[PDB]
């Protein structure tokens, strides 16, 4: 009947395990019922129509002259914008256009209260926001994509290489990075990666598309685990499984080979594909968009792990997080494909610096700041449920009491 | 049909005033 000096610890373990399980289940409860809503949100938002704005100023306006003010949800707005103001559009294959538009739309729509731009001295003053091989010193001030015509075969320059990057910081993510590259021989790459801050226990999100002459030759998407055992939390595995059952069903199960280099960083549910026709590509695209959106929405409610004086478990957790992110960075650096397509065009002393400082940098002693602008939500609120000051109350009781005589 | 025409019109109308106010703010409160 009495208890033992050990089974107390058994009780502690069981309690914290049931707590973790409960919260992980609560996280998936939202996607579980209807997974299709992770890709079909734009179509539904379009279906519901343009909302009418009811704020005192707009009501007074549309009553005075005629002018009705209309609004649109965030999904429709980021669908109207599209590949908004990228300077290298008009050169991008429509598939890469679609994917970039969707990914940046989810960033701007979900993280909008804390999304900042990465510090400008780290990438944007070195001239890394738009890179051209025919002008490696920026003596045309970044208009080389328009001033210099494409070199013909055999001339000094063939083939030309162009890159464009965008880097953001946020509250949970220390870096959200999207980069597009074009080469004259008919090659186009797209590379997206999302790193959580050094104090959050989340996997790293990653996507790569490589298409040649309009045909997608390689496509890989995965949530690379960050722990030492290559094991995600329960809810990440559950969501990936549910989404693969939803979108990828009826497609190739044997084409999902695992690259030799990913075998040390990939999760057991990574997706690598050389698509066959249009249906495979459509399935993969829907799946990638849905997976990204689910990942961001589950990040919306993350809490850091803090190291308390005396606690060793949290120190161990922090060290494991740091080492997992570093392992990902150093094992991505030897993906020799992009490395060589860079270095055979821009040199090597440039390539090493660029790949070290921007693509896969890892310095735990520096993570960029952010700017929390949540107070904005107050202002918007109080412009549609306003309050009028103590003298409109008399006028309104007069209006009611005199109108109610009918 | 009308969907895409409305998309083009609205994009143009919005980007106009966005750029107008961005330059106003920059010149008045940041060049200084």
């Amino acid at each position: 009947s009495p208890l033992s000096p050990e089974d107390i610890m058994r009780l502690v373990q069981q309690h914290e395990d049931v707590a973790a399980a409960a919260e992980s289940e609560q996280l998936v409860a939202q996607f579980r019922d209807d997974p299709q809503g992770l890709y079909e949100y734009v179509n539904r938002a379009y279906a519901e129509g343009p909302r009418r704005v009811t704020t005192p100023i707009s009501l007074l306006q549309e009553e005075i002259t005629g002018a009705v003010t209309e609004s649109y949800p965030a999904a429709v707005a980021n669908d109207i914008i599209g590949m908004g103001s990228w300077r290298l559009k008009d050169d991008v294959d429509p598939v890469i256009e679609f994917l970039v538009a969707r990914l940046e739309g989810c960033w701007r729509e979900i993280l909008d209260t804390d999304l900042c731009l990465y510090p400008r001295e780290k990438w944007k003053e070195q001239g890394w926001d738009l890179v051209d091989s025919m002008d490696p010193h920026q003596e045309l001030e970044g208009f080389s994509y328009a001033d210099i015509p494409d070199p013909a075969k055999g001339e000094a320059g063939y083939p030309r290489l162009q890159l464009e990057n965008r880097v953001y910081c946020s509250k949970v993510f220390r870096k959200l990075h999207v980069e597009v590259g074009l080469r004259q021989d008919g090659l186009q790459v797209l590379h997206v990666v999302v790193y959580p801050r050094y104090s959050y226990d989340m996997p790293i999100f990653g996507m790569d598309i490589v298409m040649v002459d309009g045909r997608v030759t390689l496509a890989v998407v995965d949530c690379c685990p960050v722990r030492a055992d290559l094991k995600l939390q329960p809810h990440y595995m559950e969501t990936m499984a549910l989404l693969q059952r939803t979108f990828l069903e009826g497609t190739d199960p044997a084409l999902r080979r695992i690259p030799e280099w990913g075998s040390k960083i990939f999760s057991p549910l990574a997706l690598c594909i050389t698509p066959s026709g249009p249906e495979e590509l459509a399935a993969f695209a829907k799946y990638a968009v849905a997976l990204h959106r689910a990942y961001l929405t589950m990040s919306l409610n993350a809490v850091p792990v803090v190291a308390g004086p005396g606690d060793r478990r949290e120190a161990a957790r922090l060290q494991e997080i740091q080492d997992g992110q570093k392992r990902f960075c150093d094992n991505q650096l030897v993906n020799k494909k992009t490395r060589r397509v860079l270095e055979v065009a821009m040199g090597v002393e440039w390539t090493e610096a660029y790949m070290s400082q921007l693509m896969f940098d890892f310095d735990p002693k520096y993570e960029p700041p952010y700017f929390d602008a949540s107070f904005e939500k107050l202002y918007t609120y109080f412009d549609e449920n306003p309050s009028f000051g103590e003298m409109a109350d008399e006028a309104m009781e007069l209006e009611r009491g005199a109108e109610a005589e009918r | 049909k009308k969907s895409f025409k409305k998309k083009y019109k609205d994009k143009a109308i919005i980007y106009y005033e966005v750029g107008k106010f961005v330059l106003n703010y920059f010149l008045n409160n940041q060049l200084t």
């Binding site: 429509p94 256009e97 679609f98 590509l281 829907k286 | 049909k1 895409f4």
Partner: peptide, 10 residues
């Protein structure tokens, strides 16, 4: 009045 974009629903 036309699309010109690629979307996975044709």
């Amino acid at each position: 009045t036309t699309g010109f974009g690629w979307d996975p629903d044709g």
